[PDB]
């Protein structure tokens, strides 16, 4: 079974960089699973995804 | 927080204050508790709401266009990428300035649709909604030149209800059956139809019929309208002649019965398509012919 | 609001009303040049220093002028264009003075949510583009016209009056190998006289032209192809006003027949304000054109009209000097052109 | 190029919007010309499989594959005489037979890319990069469009139902075989098929290779397994911005017959078969290939048979002409469904400024 954080604590800070692995788009962003802190759901709204065809 | 206890408590009142607008006015106040900067809480909450909300609503869509309307709202609120309190602010403020928004509207309209009374033109009003109410009022405050009529409708007596408050007016009032509508072709000179719902383009959504009344005004080269304020965008499309959330059976082929158990069964709801409406009623400047799609793909960017 | 504030500075409102009334100005382009020079007119000699004022002003005078008169519209379409351009720029300026501005794409919620100075140039420019889209709308439609009638098809063709659509038919008709033949319907108490000099000049240019009695279009219905509407106006909901006289019924049948109708016009007839009504906007002719005497003539009320409108129904597609628009899609077109606040004065 | 014209058949009296005719047999053939090209004309010449969608993504390959045989060279640059190849290539295409508006995008946004990459760039490093985005392009202007077209019909579609389709949409097939076997539902589905193509019965074939009833159809009646039938798609090729589909054979009958009874039809389409091109009639331009199709007594297609059949020129004047493409009407077609999930295609051009 794959679980566990990859560092010491369980929960983020503010500031610190995370690399994301998407699941599902749409209605919300992205309430996806983490790469870089722990196994559970992480979430993004429709505004700090993109800066600059977006959806495709 | 609670919807349910909201739900109960707006039915039958209206008339003041609109049903959808109390509603959105409720959502405002429950986003306005938990934050809509943390978004990991909110968006879900406000999802659960919806959920709630869909749970407890039995014949209805308007209500969930509504939440979809405010969830798109809120999203868009954010694009300032700046300070970040400000926005919040702004969100917390438009709860109550959507219920002023109102007023507005009906003003607007009170000014805008008035052109369009002539000599010796009889108006039909179908379904329930107080903008269309408020704009006969106007009408009337205007001394054009018409004729205010009413209809036989069944959900819980709204016809009468209707038949009722015109008559408080004065206007001289006769009225039309659900069937007996057919001898209409020319004499009453322009078809009204009131809006619980407005979807993609031409798609809305009234009462125990609208589309069979499209077809007839098709039949007859008749002027056809769609009569609102401002409150309900939907992303909606059926495949059929018509497909919604139904909680009232369609062709439920009552069972086997001598003393009468269930038997008011069938399609309690309407929609309308692109081709049968010549002309759209809303207070956002003068727009027809597809705007509000326009304003979805604005919106949604989906 | 009358003339009341213009003293030295702008004389040919008078001029211009006295157009509009006793007709001495005659064809839309016309109207439409004598608009932007009034324009012109207007920029050359004002007072600016502020800008909302000056916007209010050009607002006031918009509202005279449809006071005036409302049977033009190219006239209205053009301070409206005018009016959208300056606008853009206006907003620019407030964005530097002010100094987020776009997201993805122009969006909604704008309407419910919170949105020394230099503009005469730039007005200027806008009368210049202006005049440019007015100049040929012929030359930018005759690429999409040799694409639709071809060879043994029939045409039938009412309203010879707008001079874009006879230019039009010219063009279709130019080659050698391609043969066609044309039904002409003549509008009696208007059109006569023009439907007669389009025939003749049918006739000139090496066609095989067809007289058409106003009756006779049922008896020859099982051949016609194809439906034109000669109109001079454009407006909210698809919808146009005609070049008077004769349209209606010929599309009605049309549209019963189930026979193509197209729609020639150009985008500067294109108006941002809906026909609420028809009685408003069309006109009435001379009762005296049909039937001579008069003394005994109180009795014999006699009934003529010019102009015609046709409904947003009997109308198809709308190939214009930039491409095919549609009836149901006209409305962002208009938005491009004339904007929100720009409708309303 | 080669060797052009030199064809039997008349001109024809009735109907010559467009020219009728080749490169069949090759003869003769030039040292620059990929043989792949060569072998997709030579399918196509005589192809029953492939339809609008599927071609584009052949062509798409093949371009693919073209770019990586080719090198910068010594003399000439990158951006030298490219150009000129894609030209002539489009033109060979043309002289085989004409193609659709897709092709058109993808050609235009190849050329797009050709602009954008600047030659100082270092060679082996550009190529690397601009396959990958090539990859990328084409997950997400097909596959991705594909994916979101299914998910619209999940959304759409009723508890369990009765589908009618014509042709071979690659795309619609999938959808089927996706209800069938994935999210696992009822399908009684029902093909109509023409003479000249066989696309229908592949299809069929294709349907019971993977397990799934189908009812056969042919042109005589349609009618008679609808007077039941309750929701329905069509074939698709190319949209207009009137608001029109150029599509093919016989499915404007059947969006007639739909219309007249019971229940409108609905199409759901790629976000990238847009036009903004127009037209309104079967006389604008028609899509032929050569009376031949008919002349074989029925069955199969290669059997070569001694019986009557066969007068193009023999008997006192004889023509026996057909069409592949019509126009689908505009009424009836309420539905279009794309990369962007939802609307009507009275929002004809809708897209096109967002893109």
């Given at each position: 079974?794959?679980?566990?954080?990859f560092?010491?604590?369980?929960?983020?800070?503010?500031?610190?960089?995370?690399?994301?692995?998407?699941?599902?788009?749409?209605?919300?962003?992205?309430?996806?699973?983490?790469?870089?802190?722990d196994?559970?759901?992480?979430?993004?709204?429709?505004?700090?995804?993109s800066?600059?065809?977006?959806?495709? | 927080?609670?919807?349910?206890?909201?739900?109960?408590?707006?039915?039958?009142?209206?008339?003041?204050?609109?049903?959808?607008?109390?509603?959105?006015?409720?959502?405002?106040?429950?986003?306005?508790?938990?934050?809509?900067?943390?978004?990991?809480?909110?968006?879900?909450?406000?999802?659960?709401?919806?959920?709630?909300?869909?749970?407890?609503?039995?014949?209805?869509?308007?209500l969930?266009?509504?939440?979809?309307?405010?969830?798109?709202?809120?999203?868009?609120?954010?694009?300032?990428?700046?300070?970040?309190?400000?926005?919040?602010?702004?969100?917390?403020e438009?709860?109550?300035?959507?219920?002023?928004?109102?007023?507005?509207?009906?003003?607007?309209?009170?000014?805008?649709?008035?052109?369009?009374?002539?000599?010796?033109?009889?108006?039909?009003?179908?379904?329930?909604?107080?903008?269309?109410?408020?704009?006969?009022?106007?009408?009337?405050?205007?001394?054009?030149?018409?004729?205010?009529?009413?209809?036989?409708?069944?959900?819980?007596?709204?016809?009468?209800?209707?038949?009722?408050?015109?008559?408080?007016?004065?206007?001289?009032?006769?009225?039309?059956?659900?069937?007996?509508?057919?001898?209409?072709?020319?004499?009453?000179?322009?078809?009204?139809?009131?809006?619980?719902?407005?979807?993609?383009s031409?798609?809305?959504?009234?009462?125990?019929?609208?589309?069979?009344?499209?077809?007839?005004?098709?039949?007859?080269?008749?002027?056809?309208?769609?009569?609102?304020?401002?409150?309900?965008?939907?992303?909606?499309?059926?495949?059929?002649?018509?497909?919604?959330?139904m909680?009232?059976?369609?062709?439920?082929?009552?069972?086997?019965?001598?003393?009468?158990?269930?038997?008011?069964?069938?399609?309690?709801?309407?929609?309308?398509?692109?081709?049968?409406?010549?002309?759209?009623?809303?207070?956002?400047?003068?727009?027809?012919?597809?705007?509000?799609?326009?304003?979805?793909?604005?919106?949604?960017?989906? | 609001?009358?003339?009341?504030?213009?003293?030295?500075?702008?004389?040919?409102?008078?001029?211009?009303?006295?157009?509009?009334?006793?007709?001495?100005?005659?064809?839309?382009?016309?109207?439409?040049?004598?608009?932007?020079?009034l324009?012109?007119?207007?920029?050359?000699?004002?007072?600016?220093?502020?800008?909302?004022?000056?916007?209010?002003?050009?607002?006031?005078?918009?509202?005279?002028?449809?006071?005036?008169?409302?049977?033009?519209?190219?006239?209205?379409?053009?301070?409206?264009?005018?009016?959208?351009?300056?606008?853009?720029?206006?907003?620019?300026?407030?964005?530097?003075?002010?100094?987020?501005?776009?997201?993805?794409?122009?969006?909604?919620?704008?309407?419910?949510?919170?949105?020394?100075?230099?503009?005469?140039?730039?007005?200027?420019?806008?009368?210049?583009?202006?005049?440019?889209?007015?100049?040929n709308?012929?030359?930018?439609?005759?690429?999409?016209?040799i694409?639709?009638?071809?060879?043994?098809?029939?045409?039938?063709?009412?309203?010879?009056?707008?001079?874009?659509?006879?230019?039009?038919?010219?063009?279709?008709?130019?080659?050698?190998?391609?043969?066609?033949?044309?039904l002409?319907?003549?509008?009696?108490?208007?059109?006569?006289?023009?439907?007669?000099?389009?025939?003749?000049?049918?006739?000139?240019?090496?066609?095989?032209?067809?007289?058409?009695?106003?009756?006779?279009?049922?008896?020859?219905?099982?051949?016609?192809?194809?439906?034109?509407?000669?109109?001079?106006?454009?407006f909210?909901?698809?919808?146009?006003?005609?070049?008077?006289?004769?349209?209606?019924?010929?599309?009605?049948?049309?549209?019963?027949?189930?026979?193509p109708?197209?729609?020639?016009?150009?985008?500067?007839?294109?108006?941002?304000?809906?026909?609420?009504?028809?009685?408003?906007?069309?006109?009435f002719?001379?009762?005296?054109?049909?039937?001579?005497?008069?003394?005994?003539?109180?009795?014999?009320?006699?009934?003529?009209?010019?102009?015609?409108?046709?409904?947003?129904?009997?109308?198809?597609?709308?190939?214009?000097?930039?491409?095919?628009?549609?009836?149901?899609?006209?409305?962002?077109?208009?938005?491009?052109?004339?904007?929100?606040?720009?409708?309303?004065? | 190029?080669?060797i052009?014209?030199?064809?039997?058949?008349?001109?024809?009296?009735?109907?010559?919007?467009?020219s009728?005719?080749?490169?069949?047999?090759?003869?003769?053939?030039?040292?620059?010309?990929?043989?792949?090209i060569?072998?997709?004309?030579?399918?196509?010449?005589?192809?029953?499989?492939?339809?609008?969608?599927?071609?584009?993504?052949?062509?798409?390959?093949?371009?693919?594959?073209?770019?990586?045989?080719?090198?910068?060279?010594?003399?000439?640059?990158?951006?030298?005489?490219?150009?000129?190849?894609?030209?002539?290539?489009?033109?060979?295409?043309?002289?085989?037979?004409?193609?659709?508006?897709?092709?058109?995008?993808?050609?235009?946004?190849?050329?797009?890319?050709?602009?954008?990459?600047?030659?100082?760039?270092?060679?082996?490093?550009?190529?690397?990069?601009?396959?990958?985005?090539?990859?990328?392009f084409?997950?997400?202007?097909?596959?991705?469009?594909?994916?979101?077209?299914?998910?619209?019909?999940?959304?759409?579609?009723?508890?369990?139902?009765?589908?009618?389709?014509?042709?071979?949409?690659?795309?619609?097939?999938?959808?089927?075989?996706?209800?069938?076997?994935?999210?696992?539902?009822?399908?009684?589905v029902?093909?109509?098929?023409?003479?000249?193509?066989?696309?229908?019965?592949?299809?069929?074939?294709?349907?019971?290779?993977?397990?799934?009833?189908?009812?056969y159809?042919?042109?005589?009646?349609?009618?008679?397994?609808?007077?039941?039938?309750?929701?329905?798609?069509?074939?698709?090729?190319?949209?207009?911005?009137?608001?029109?589909?150029?599509?093919?054979a016989?499915?404007?009958?059947?969006?007639?017959?739909?219309?007249?009874?019971?229940?409108?039809?609905?199409?759901?389409?790629?976000?990238?078969?847009?036009?903004?091109?127009?037209?309104?009639?079967?006389?604008?331009?028609?899509?032929?290939?050569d009376?031949?199709?008919?002349?074989?007594?029925?069955?199969?297609?290669?059997?070569?048979?001694?019986?009557?059949?066969?007068?193009?020129?023999?008997?006192?004047?004889?023509?026996?002409?057909?069409?592949?493409?019509?126009?689908?009407?505009?009424?009836?077609?309420?539905?279009?469904?794309?990369?962007?999930?939802?609307?009507?295609?009275?929002?004809?051009?809708?897209?096109?400024?967002?893109?």
């Open positions: 079974t794959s679980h566990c954080r560092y010491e604590n369980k929960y983020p800070e503010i500031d610190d960089i995370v690399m994301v692995n998407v699941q599902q788009i749409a209605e919300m962003g992205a309430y996806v699973k983490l790469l870089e802190y196994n559970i759901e992480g979430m993004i709204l429709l505004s700090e995804l800066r600059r065809s977006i959806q495709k | 927080f609670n919807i349910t206890e909201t739900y109960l408590r707006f039915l039958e009142e209206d008339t003041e204050m609109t049903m959808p607008i109390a509603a959105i006015e409720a959502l405002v106040t429950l986003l306005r508790i938990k934050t809509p900067e943390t978004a990991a809480e909110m968006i879900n909450t406000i999802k659960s709401s919806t959920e709630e909300l869909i749970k407890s609503i039995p014949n209805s869509v308007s969930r266009a509504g939440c979809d309307i405010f969830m798109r709202f809120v999203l868009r609120n954010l694009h300032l990428y700046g300070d970040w309190e400000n926005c919040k602010q702004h969100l917390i438009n709860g109550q300035l959507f219920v002023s928004r109102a007023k507005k509207s009906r003003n607007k309209i009170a000014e805008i649709g008035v052109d369009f009374i002539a000599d010796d033109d009889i108006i039909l009003v179908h379904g329930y909604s107080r903008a269309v109410f408020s704009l006969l009022n106007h009408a009337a405050n205007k001394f054009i030149r018409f004729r205010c009529v009413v209809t036989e409708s069944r959900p819980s007596k709204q016809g009468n209800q209707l038949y009722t408050l015109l008559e408080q007016k004065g206007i001289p009032v006769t009225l039309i059956v659900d069937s007996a509508v057919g001898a209409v072709i020319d004499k009453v000179d322009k078809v009204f139809v009131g809006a619980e719902g407005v979807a993609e031409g798609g809305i959504i009234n009462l125990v019929g609208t589309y069979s009344v499209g077809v007839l005004a098709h039949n007859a080269r008749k002027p056809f309208y769609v009569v609102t304020e401002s409150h309900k965008f939907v992303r909606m499309f059926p495949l059929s002649s018509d497909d919604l959330p909680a009232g059976p369609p062709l439920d082929f009552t069972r086997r019965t001598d003393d009468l158990e269930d038997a008011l069964r069938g399609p309690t709801i309407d929609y309308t398509a692109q081709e049968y409406i010549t002309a759209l009623i809303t207070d956002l400047g003068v727009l027809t012919p597809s705007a509000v799609s326009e304003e979805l793909i604005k919106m949604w960017y989906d | 609001h009358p003339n009341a504030a213009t003293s030295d500075v702008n004389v040919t409102i008078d001029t211009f009303v006295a157009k509009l009334k006793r007709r001495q100005v005659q064809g839309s382009y016309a109207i439409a040049l004598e608009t932007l020079q324009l012109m007119r207007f920029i050359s000699a004002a007072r600016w220093n502020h800008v909302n004022d000056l916007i209010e002003q050009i607002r006031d005078l918009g509202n005279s002028l449809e006071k005036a008169h409302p049977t033009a519209f190219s006239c209205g379409n053009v301070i409206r264009r005018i009016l959208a351009v300056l606008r853009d720029e206006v907003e620019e300026d407030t964005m530097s003075t002010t100094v987020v501005a776009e997201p993805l794409i122009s969006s909604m919620f704008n309407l419910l949510q919170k949105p020394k100075t230099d503009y005469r140039q730039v007005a200027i420019q806008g009368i210049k583009d202006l005049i440019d889209e007015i100049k709308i012929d030359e930018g439609i005759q690429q999409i016209a694409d639709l009638i071809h060879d043994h098809e029939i045409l039938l063709t009412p309203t010879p009056d707008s001079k874009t659509v006879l230019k039009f038919l010219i063009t279709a008709r130019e080659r050698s190998n391609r043969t066609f033949t044309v002409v319907t003549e509008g009696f108490p208007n059109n006569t006289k023009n439907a007669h000099e389009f025939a003749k000049k049918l006739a000139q240019h090496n066609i095989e032209t067809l007289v058409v009695p106003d009756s006779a279009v049922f008896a020859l219905m099982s051949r016609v192809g194809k439906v034109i509407i000669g109109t001079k106006a454009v909210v909901n698809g919808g146009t006003i005609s070049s008077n006289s004769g349209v209606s019924s010929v599309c009605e049948c049309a549209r019963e027949f189930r026979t109708v197209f729609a020639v016009a150009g985008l500067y007839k294109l108006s941002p304000l809906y026909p609420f009504d028809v009685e408003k906007f069309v006109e002719g001379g009762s005296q054109r049909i039937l001579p005497r008069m003394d005994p003539r109180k009795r014999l009320d006699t009934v003529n009209q010019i102009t015609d409108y046709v409904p947003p129904e009997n109308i198809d597609i709308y190939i214009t000097n930039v491409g095919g628009f549609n009836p149901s899609f006209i409305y962002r077109i208009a938005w491009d052109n004339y904007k929100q606040i720009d409708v309303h004065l | 190029p080669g052009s014209s030199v064809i039997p058949t008349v001109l024809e009296q009735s109907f010559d919007n467009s009728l005719i080749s490169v069949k047999e090759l003869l003769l053939n030039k040292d620059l010309i990929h043989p792949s060569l072998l997709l004309t030579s399918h196509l010449a005589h192809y029953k499989i492939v339809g609008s969608i599927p071609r584009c993504i052949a062509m798409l390959e093949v371009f693919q594959i073209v770019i990586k045989d080719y090198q910068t060279p010594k003399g000439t640059t990158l951006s030298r005489n490219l150009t000129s190849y894609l030209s002539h290539q489009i033109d060979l295409l043309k002289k085989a037979r004409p193609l659709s508006v897709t092709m058109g995008n993808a050609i235009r946004w190849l050329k797009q890319e050709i602009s954008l990459i600047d030659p100082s760039t270092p060679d082996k490093a550009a190529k690397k990069d601009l396959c990958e985005k090539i990859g990328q084409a997950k997400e202007k097909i596959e991705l469009a594909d994916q979101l077209i299914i998910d619209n019909a999940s959304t759409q579609i009723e508890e369990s139902t009765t589908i009618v389709t014509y042709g071979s949409s690659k795309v619609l097939t999938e959808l089927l075989l996706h209800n069938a076997i994935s999210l696992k539902k009822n399908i009684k029902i093909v109509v098929d023409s003479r000249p193509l066989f696309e229908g019965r592949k299809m069929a074939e294709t349907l019971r290779n993977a397990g799934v009833n189908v009812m159809a042919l042109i005589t009646s349609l009618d008679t397994i609808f007077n039941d039938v309750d929701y329905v798609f069509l074939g698709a090729h190319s949209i207009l911005s009137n608001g029109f589909l150029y599509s093919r016989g499915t404007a009958m059947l969006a007639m017959s739909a219309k007249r009874r019971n229940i409108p039809v609905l199409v759901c389409c790629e976000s990238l078969k847009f036009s903004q091109r127009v037209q309104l009639d079967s006389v604008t331009f028609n899509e032929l290939a009376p031949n199709d008919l002349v074989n007594i029925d069955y199969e297609n290669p059997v070569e048979r001694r019986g009557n059949k066969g007068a193009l020129l023999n008997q006192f004047i004889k023509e026996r002409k057909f069409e592949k493409k019509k126009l689908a009407m505009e009424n009836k077609p309420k539905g279009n469904k794309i990369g962007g999930k939802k609307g009507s295609e009275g929002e004809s051009k809708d897209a096109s400024n967002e893109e």
